[PDB]
Design an enzyme around this catalytic site. Sequence first.
Site, PDB file in Angstrom:
ATOM      1  N   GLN A  56     -11.935  -0.037  -0.612  1.00 35.14           N
ATOM      2  CA  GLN A  56     -12.046   0.580  -1.933  1.00 35.14           C
ATOM      3  C   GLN A  56     -13.081  -0.158  -2.792  1.00 35.14           C
ATOM      4  OE1 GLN A  56      -7.760  -0.585  -3.138  1.00 35.14           O
ATOM      5  NE2 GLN A  56      -8.884  -0.502  -5.066  1.00 35.14           N
ATOM      6  N   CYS A  79      -6.736   2.417  -5.610  1.00 36.80           N
ATOM      7  CA  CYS A  79      -5.841   2.129  -4.477  1.00 36.80           C
ATOM      8  C   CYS A  79      -4.882   3.304  -4.264  1.00 36.80           C
ATOM      9  CB  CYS A  79      -5.072   0.826  -4.727  1.00 36.80           C
ATOM     10  SG  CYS A  79      -3.961   0.872  -6.160  1.00 36.80           S
TER      11      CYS A  79
END
Length: 222
Positions: free
Chosen positions: A19, A25
């Site tokens: 990410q 997330c």
Amino acid sequence: VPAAVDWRTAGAVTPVKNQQQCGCCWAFSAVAAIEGATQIKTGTLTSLSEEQIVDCDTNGNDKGCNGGTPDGAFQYVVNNQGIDTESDYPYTAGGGSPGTCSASSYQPAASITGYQDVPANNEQALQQAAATQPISVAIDASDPSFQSYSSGIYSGPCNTNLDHAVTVVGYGTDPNSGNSYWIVKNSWGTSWGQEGYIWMQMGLNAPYGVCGIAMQASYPTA
């Protein structure tokens, strides 16, 4: 309920992703769970687009790089009636900036009809769900021991100030210690942990679970 589960060697988990510097997330955890549910249903394992959810899921409580929840991501995919591939709609928000929604520019590769929330603060219920498919979970990942994790069974120290979504892809038991653990796919690339994975000990910090892993868990219905 089986004593051991590993969705990676069962074929329902794609490679580890990163990410980078985007607080999304929530979308990585949701996508890993959708990839798993889709493979179990159809037999096909395909990497799906986090960027689509980050860019397009803007009419609800999810806020791109500014956070969201796996359930909000599932709701978006349900409402959109599909999600595109990673190959067609790649991740570009790594520098902390999403883009314009491009969901309709590609052929959707997967869909889900809903999602289920696991009973809260309940590792038995989490284990029952994890035996059937990968599960999105929330944890407190703020301790330096978690940030610098490399190997072994992680037992903390960690609190329950939830701030990061990850994906449970199975559980096992270490033969020498006899301690059981959740097999967790993180979204911090392969340089972190065990090639991107962490073993988080089961049966700790009752009823919340280690770092709060049993507090806020859910999974999509393919």
